[PDB]
Write a protein that binds this ligand. Structure first.
Ligand SMILES: [Zn+2]
Ligand SMILES: [Zn+2]
Ligand SMILES: [Zn+2]
Ligand SMILES: [Zn+2]
Ligand SMILES: [Zn+2]
Ligand SMILES: [Zn+2]
Ligand SMILES: [Zn+2]
Lengths: 86, 557, 72, 480, 20, 90, 636, 70
């Protein structure tokens, strides 16, 4: 019912929260608002409702947000993984 | 010669009438100028000609052949100029006033109808059109404005048309103009601000009442409405001041509650309302109802607390407030004392409470007590405090009688100082008349003998009463290791007599000393047991003649 | 025996001699008893039997000319 | 003659009881009655103390000698102090005597009966003080004036009487005969290392019975000093000293002057310091002194109990607060931990002698508050590993004194109590607390940080702390 | 009702003023 | 109304203003002499991931009656489990 | 990273910090990357692994700041006529410098400075101690710059203010800033934050305040008139209360205004009381407003002014009633005294803001007016208030409407409260109620009830216990009289008696004669009829029958035309013996009248006064022998 | 003939009978016209005069006695 959302595109990473009832189109709009891009150049891509994708408040947590995934152009994903722990 | 002069006057009037009709839209100025010429010539020539006077006939001719024929035109001119002046346009004031004075002068000689022609030619249509203009203007203002600005503009206009009338109008018609404008302005809208007033009075905004009251006083029919409305308002506030008071400190706050409300509300009437009496009377009615209602469930508690309230000043109190400030609160207390519902209810309270004052010497100063007595007298007559005065004289005399007893002592032992108080039952209300008989102890047995000789030589046809139960005295118990002083009653002291000789005493003996019934003496010994000076030899609560009691050798007091 | 103060009332007896109801001394018993004594809030004094008799005859005070009452 | 450690020989203790039959054999056995004790007493001096005329008969038969002991008192004055007029009569009848001690004894003999706890006599007070005074004026050539002593607030500014006219005029006032006698004893026995405390306690106790609390306090105040000159423990005198206030303060007679309490506490300041200094003197022997030391510690609370109830201008507390911090900076160390803040909050069981009442209550709210108002160390820890909040949660009857239990926690979270602390075996404040309602208030006052319990994860792993952390942070590993 | 200190004399040190 | 955190590893996390204003030292740098700029030069990226998560935790689950869930800390912590707040005053 | 580095030579890394902080505290443009690197380096130092390095930083920064302050002071001093102007700018810079410096490094401020400090406890109980950076950087601006220039700056600033008493003001904000800096220098202290500002600024200012206005007041008073001086003063106080709002800390207005008061007015007060007599006397209005406002500051001002005002009323009270119209003693009196109390009420609310004290003065003012007047002996005043209440309630042609009389009784109460001995008033009022209503009704019943309603609430509730039932007593009269008529139905000259049922000891008629005139002769049927009806309805109570002094109308039948004239029971019965015989002997009446001759012949003498009989014997005195004859010529 | 007015003073029957000081008829009998004053107490006029010449104070409340009206 509430899922914390993680934006991974190359270096950048963006944090916030949204409701499952929201649609992909609204999240597209939020991304455009925060990054100043047109919707066509935006392409949302996980690895009417955010729950129609397979997400739940049980998997996603304020402290343990379920790993999600996104990308940007129509170039494929290029995500640098975090550093290895010592 | 007079008739021939009239003929030539007709001739010149005809000439001037032709000259006037020749004038195109210039009729007013030239006619006025020829009017002054005519008037001055008439003055000269009537001074020459000093059946009726030539001057009056000349004035009548002047009026008949110009004023009457040209009356429609001149009236239209006047109404147009008046409408212009209402619109801010400035006409020739000199011409207008001069023509008005011409109307005044033409019919001035005739004792009958001095301005009636003057009124009918101009005043009636003028008033009609002016009333119509105020009707239209007031409708326009009410359509697109609120009450306050409308009233302020009405006042400003009232002054402006007053100025204009003083510029032109005769002194007689100011009242008529004011009446007609008043009828036009308010006669149709004085019933809307009567409901709004309830919010205005609730708003408690100082300027709001003042802005409304300036003209609400002028209108008559509305005046009763606010008076009740204001009376209801303060009555609503008064009951609000009743609720927040607590029961524990009720006597002190009750005085403060009315004072805190009375003080702040009176100045409101003086400032905004010019301190009219009618509003003050309404306050008293509601406040009396506030006083009439009693927050404590006990009836007449407000008079009941009042005696205790006054007793605080009356009783010797640690940290005494300034006697000057005391006089101030006492004079303030008089203001409340009017609102009392029943004085005799308070009088009963005051008398009973006053009893303890000379019992225990609660009053710090005897003169302060006297001040109230004089203050009360000025309020409600002599008979209201007849006993309250004879009683005071009774105690002051006792000082000399004790000295006369001291003189009698010179005229003359228990070894113990004996004190005497002499009173009067009619002055001093003690309904408790003891029916039982008490045997006097040995020590007072001496005191009785000398008093009779003392009393006989000084007083005749008299009698004195001995109430022993009310007598109180402190007694120090000697046999205690640490001496202790405790106040005990005389009836106890009679019972206390048999404890010194024998520690354990049966109940039967003490009745012989008291010579009064054991059932009431049972409460006496029971009262002694609770003090625990003696410890009962029987654990039972009930006390009979058989039961004995053991003296407590180690009792501490 | 350390200290004693005397309080005394001064009055007379020639003013009043009999009950206004029983026609006998107020201190003494009423005519029926010769008792009990009652008092009203107007401080009028009569025998309780006298008061009861007068009240059952009439609910009017002998002196205050009102409804007779009991203070205590 | 072979004696004990205190040099009391066999026949020294024979005359102590008074059985002349044994002493009669002993002296006839060519035994010397003049052997000196540890102070320096002799059988005659014991006979002077004992006052048995029967034993002295054998002593005079065997020519016993006069010896002054280490205290500096003659046996002739000992009989005067012993209140044995008959023995005085015999020794005044003795062939060899010195008149110097006779006057000195008789003046003290008169002051002996006046100040006597049980055998007090005002007749013997005047009779023997006048006889001694006439001995001074027995001769016009030599005029002996009883030297006056400096006026004292304890003495009420009285000087020693110098003439019979003064003595004759004061036969009326019993206390004046009482009051003069103390000056005689003080003037004479001041040089001697001999106490005069017993008369002053008798005077105060009667004054305690006479509501003359003003005089008894001042009289004991000098008696406090009298104990000091003799280097004698005042704690027993202090033990009764506190109990005196314990009654009348409860009776609310008068609580006017706390500035005197400053003098009282300043007096016990060095006493506790000396008590602490005594602890520095001996280590094994202070085992029982610990309780007396604890008693002095208890008096502190009871003094605070009085200090809490009495109120005055802040300057008086400023005088009071200065020596408090001295106690604070001085070691409050107690066995099994339990410093004063520990002892102030917990059930303060060692209370008695009217202190087991409302004056000294176990929950004591304000006293714990005022201790923090003094500024003591909040985060002191017992050897058990216990904290300040480790004890307050361990409180029975939470419903009783509910406001007090709430009130203390209000201040304790302030001034730096570490919210959850574990020492030795794991003891979280939730764990130590056993009453649910109390734990609720603990939950209300939590404040969330990061490391305050995040570090606790490392104990579950327990990697090498040392040489991997800044200097100051190393303790946060230790705390958790 | 008011108690008094014992002041018990030590048998070994028989002198009153010297007490332990 | 947005702030950016840069690390020594090149990553750039962005969150809202208040989540950053939780700490003290962060406001210290932001008070020093439009999108603002902050640079931590001496720290990896793992700890910044965790610190952002804690910001979310504190802002959400404050003073709520419902039982607060636990935080799944990792095994390999060592230094940050202390220094995290000893340098970022958190 | 962020661990312990093995070695860091502060002798190497200190130079970057010394380069950047100097720039910072002078408000030049700094660089962000350097800004963060500086935090990094400070944390790196604050924990040096071989030995922590804390205090060297402290010492170096102290010395650096001290040198900077002195270097500023040297340029500050050697500048004439601009010293405070440049002081302003330098201070305004250094201030913000301090806060930015503190906000730069905090870790030292809170992890090595705090942990070794001195609590306020030892501060109150008591080597220069350790302390926080910001307040050190601020405090160092005291021991170097303020003290050596203290005298110069105080003198210059006082010169500026002194010139500012003139209209123009050289400058507005600079002096405000330099004054306000004194307070803010001592930001962190335990107690008395204002002690410095009070110690070094207040005293010269206050002492200089007095003399300027002392001289100005002297100059004004020596050549000004009382009203002129009174007007002049009010402006200057407002001027100074405006002035103090600029150049001072707000919490010192009180002392300044207070000193102005005690140096402007209170010391010249001997002049103000000198003219307080006249200004009241000429009844001038304007000076009241000024005089009242000015005195209340000083306590002793009011008492004399009140006592003077009161004595003015006491004259106007009596002179308004010097003489009275005999025709209108009740009318003229109440009309005069009523308005004087009216007019002086408006004045108090108009000008003096309705002080409670003044309204007390009026009440004692009039109690010397109404409660007594010197002539006409004593007690003449309180009695006549009845007569005004009598005719106002007597049947008056063109009687005032019920509304206006109602208000008339409401206005009447105000005069009532002043009369002292109300007891005589009751007795005079009761006598009226007797003769009004029995002889002839005067006003409606409700109106007569209205007066009783006010008195009941007015004073002494239930001393009007007397007379209260009287209104009810006549009300029930005719009502039971109907019940008497019912008995009359079951069982004469058309005569019915009034019921006269009303309490003894009230309604005072008295006048009990011994003779009692015996009984009427013509008829007795009347008497028994009442008793029979009365006895059954009323039992256990007495019978009174005061048959005398009982009014009755008579219809005489000796003339052809009967006439209506008043006749009384004694008189009319004597007339009845005259019906049969014109000439009657004296003794015959005494047999019938059975009453004293004086009053019998007095009623007969009453006959002679009306000339209704002719005495046959010439002498006016009539004995038994003397006879008399009927008057045939008499008509009524 | 047209109208009479009959007036009198009605009250209880036994409340007041005669003079308190002297139990005689209120008129011309004493052990005497009705006397009145401020206190308004009525006693036999001969008794009034004798009491006054013995004691000028009121017999009931010992107040001044002035002959008010009767
Ligand atoms: Zn009776
Ligand atoms: Zn009976
Ligand atoms: Zn009654
Ligand atoms: Zn922690
Ligand atoms: Zn007679
Ligand atoms: Zn009589
Ligand atoms: Zn009387």
């Amino acid at each position: 019912m509430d899922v914390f959302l993680m934006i991974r595109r190359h270096k950048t990473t963006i944090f916030t929260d949204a409701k499952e009832s929201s649609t992909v189109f609204e999240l597209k709009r939020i991304v455009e608002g925060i990054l100043k891009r047109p919707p066509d150049e935006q392409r949302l891509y996980k690895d009417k409702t955010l729950g129609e994708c397979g997400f739940t408040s049980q998997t996603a947590r304020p402290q343990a947000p379920a790993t999600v995934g996104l990308a940007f152009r129509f170039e494929a994903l290029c995500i640098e993984p975090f550093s290895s722990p010592p | 010669l007079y008739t021939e002069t009239k003929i030539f006057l007709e001739n010149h009037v005809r000439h001037l009438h032709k000259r006037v009709l020749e004038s195109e839209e210039q009729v007013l100025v030239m006619y006025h100028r020829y009017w002054e010429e005519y008037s001055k010539g008439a003055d000269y020539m009537d001074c020459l000609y000093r059946l009726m006077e030539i001057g009056e006939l000349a004035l009548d001719m002047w009026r008949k052949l110009m004023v009457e024929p040209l009356q429609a035109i001149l009236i239209r001119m006047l109404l147009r100029e008046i409408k212009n002046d209402r619109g801010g346009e400035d006409p020739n004031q000199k011409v207008i006033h001069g023509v008005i004075n011409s109307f005044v002068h033409v019919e001035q000689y005739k004792k009958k109808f001095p301005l009636k022609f003057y009124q009918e030619i101009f005043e009636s249509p003028f008033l009609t059109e002016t009333g119509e203009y105020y009707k239209q203007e007031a409708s326009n203002l009410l359509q697109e404005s609120n009450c306050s600005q409308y009233m302020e503009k009405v006042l400003g206009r009232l002054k402006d048309e007053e100025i204009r009338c003083r510029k032109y109008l005769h002194p007689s018609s100011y009242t008529k103009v004011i009446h007609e404008c008043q009828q036009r302005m308010v006669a149709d809208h004085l019933q809307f601000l009567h409901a709004e007033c309830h919010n205005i009075i609730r708003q408690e905004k100082k300027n709001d009442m003042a802005n409304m009251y300036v003209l609400l006083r002028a209108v008559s029919t509305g005046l009763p409405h606010m008076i009740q409305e204001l009376q209801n308002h303060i009555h609503d506030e008064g009951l609000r001041a009743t609720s927040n008071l607590t029961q524990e400190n009720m006597p002190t706050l009750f005085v403060e509650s009315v004072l805190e409300v009375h003080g702040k509300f009176v100045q409101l009437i003086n400032t905004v309302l010019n301190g009219d009496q009618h509003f003050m009377s309404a306050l008293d009615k509601a406040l009396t109802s506030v006083v009439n209602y009693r927050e404590p469930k006990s009836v007449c508690k407000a008079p009941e607390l009042l005696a205790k309230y006054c007793d605080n000043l009356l009783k010797k109190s640690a940290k005494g407030m300034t006697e000057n400030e005391v006089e101030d609160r006492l004079t303030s207390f008089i203001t409340v004392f009017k609102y009392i519902d029943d004085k005799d209810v308070f009088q009963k309270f005051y008398a009973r409470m006053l009893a303890k004052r000379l019992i225990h010497g609660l009053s710090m100063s005897m003169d302060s007590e006297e001040a109230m007595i004089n203050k009360l007298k000025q309020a409600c007559g002599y008979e209201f405090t007849s006993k309250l005065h004879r009683m005071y004289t009774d105690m002051s005399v006792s000082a000399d009688l004790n000295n006369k007893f001291n003189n009698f002592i010179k005229n003359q032992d228990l070894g113990i100082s004996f004190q005497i108080y002499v009173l009067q039952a009619g002055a001093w209300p003690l309904t408790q008349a003891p029916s039982s008989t008490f045997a006097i102890p040995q020590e007072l047995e001496k005191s009785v003998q000398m008093f009779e000789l003392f009393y006989s030589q000084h007083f005749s046809g008299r009698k004195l009463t001995w109430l022993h139960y009310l007598c109180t005295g402190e007694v120090k118990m000697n046999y205690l290791g640490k001496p202790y002083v405790a106040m005990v009653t005389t009836y106890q002291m009679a019972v206390l007599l048999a404890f010194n000789n024998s520690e354990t005493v049966s109940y039967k003996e003490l009745q012989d000393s008291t010579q009064m019934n054991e059932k009431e003496l049972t409460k006496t010994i029971k009262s002694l047991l609770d003090v625990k000076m003696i410890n009962h030899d029987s654990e039972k609560e009930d006390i009979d003649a058989e039961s004995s009691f053991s003296l407590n050798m180690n009792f501490s007091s | 025996v350390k200290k004693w103060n005397a309080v005394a009332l001064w009055a007379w007896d020639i003013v009043v001699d009999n009950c206004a109801i029983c026609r006998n001394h107020i201190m003494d018993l009423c005519i029926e008893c010769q008792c009990t004594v009652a008092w009203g809030v107007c401080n009028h004094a009569f025998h309780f039997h006298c008061i009861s008799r007068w009240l059952k005859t009439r609910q009017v005070c002998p002196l205050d000319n009102r409804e007779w009452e009991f203070q205590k | 003659s072979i004696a004990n450690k205190y040099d009391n020989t066999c026949l020294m203790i024979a005359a102590y009881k008074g059985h002349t039959d044994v002493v009669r054999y002993l002296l006839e056995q060519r035994a010397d009655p003049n052997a000196k004790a540890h102070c320096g007493a002799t059988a005659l001096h014991f006979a002077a103390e004992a006052g048995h005329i029967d034993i002295v008969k054998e002593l005079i038969k065997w020519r016993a000698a006069i010896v002054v002991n280490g205290h500096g008192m003659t046996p002739l004055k000992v009989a005067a102090e012993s209140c044995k007029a008959d023995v005085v009569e015999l020794l005044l009848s003795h062939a060899d005597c010195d008149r110097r001690s006779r006057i000195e004894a008789l003046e003290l003999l008169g002051a002996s009966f006046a100040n006597d706890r049980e055998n007090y006599d005002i007749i013997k007070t005047y009779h023997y003080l006048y006889l001694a005074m006439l001995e001074r004026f027995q001769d016009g050539d030599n005029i002996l004036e009883k030297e006056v002593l400096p006026p004292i607030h304890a003495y009420g500014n009285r000087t020693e009487c110098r003439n019979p006219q003064e003595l004759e005029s004061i036969r009326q006032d019993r206390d004046a005969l009482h009051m003069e006698g103390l000056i005689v004893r003080e003037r004479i026995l001041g040089a001697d290392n001999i106490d005069v405390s017993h008369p002053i306690i008798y005077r105060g106790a009667v004054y305690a019975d006479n509501m003359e609390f003003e005089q008894c306090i001042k009289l004991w105040l000098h008696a406090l000093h009298l104990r000091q000159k003799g280097n004698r423990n005042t704690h027993k005198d202090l033990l009764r000293f506190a109990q005196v206030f314990s009654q009348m303060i409860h009776l609310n007679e008068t609580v006017k002057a706390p500035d005197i309490e400053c003098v009282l506490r300043c007096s016990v300041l060095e006493i506790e310091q000396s008590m602490n200094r005594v602890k520095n003197i001996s280590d094994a022997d202070v085992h029982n002194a610990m309780d007396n030391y604890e008693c002095n510690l208890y008096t502190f609370l009871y003094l605070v109990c009085i200090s809490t109830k009495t109120q005055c201008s802040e300057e008086d507390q400023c005088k009071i607060n200065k020596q408090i911090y001295n106690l604070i900076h001085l070691d409050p160390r107690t066995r099994e931990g339990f410093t004063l803040l520990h002892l102030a909050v917990n059930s303060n069981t060692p209370v008695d002698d009217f202190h087991t009442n409302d004056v000294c209550s176990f929950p004591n709210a304000l006293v714990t508050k005022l201790l923090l108002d003094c500024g003591a160390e909040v985060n002191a820890v017992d050897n058990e590993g216990n904290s300040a909040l480790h004890i307050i949660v361990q409180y029975n009857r939470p419903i009783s004194d509910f406001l007090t239990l709430h009130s203390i926690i209000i201040s304790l979270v302030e001034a730096g109590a570490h919210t959850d602390m574990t020492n030795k075996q794991n003891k979280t404040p939730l764990d130590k607390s056993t009453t649910g309602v109390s734990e609720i208030l603990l939950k209300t006052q939590m404040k969330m940080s990061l490391k305050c319990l995040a570090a606790r994860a490392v104990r579950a792993n327990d990697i090498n702390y040392q040489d991997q952390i800044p200097r100051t942070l190393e303790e946060f590993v230790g705390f958790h | 009702l008011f108690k008094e200190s014992e002041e018990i004399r030590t048998p070994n040190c028989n002198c009153k003023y010297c007490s332990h | 109304m947005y702030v950016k955190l840069i690390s020594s590893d090149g990553h750039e996390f962005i969150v809202k203003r208040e989540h950053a204003l939780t700490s003290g030292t962060i406001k210290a740098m932001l008070s020093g002499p439009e999108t603002n700029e902050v640079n931590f030069r001496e720290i990896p990226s793992h700890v910044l991931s965790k610190v952002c998560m804690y910001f979310t935790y504190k802002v959400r689950y404050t003073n709520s009656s419902t039982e607060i869930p636990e935080f799944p800390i990792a095994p390999e912590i060592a230094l940050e489990l202390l220094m995290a707040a000893n340098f970022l005053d958190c």
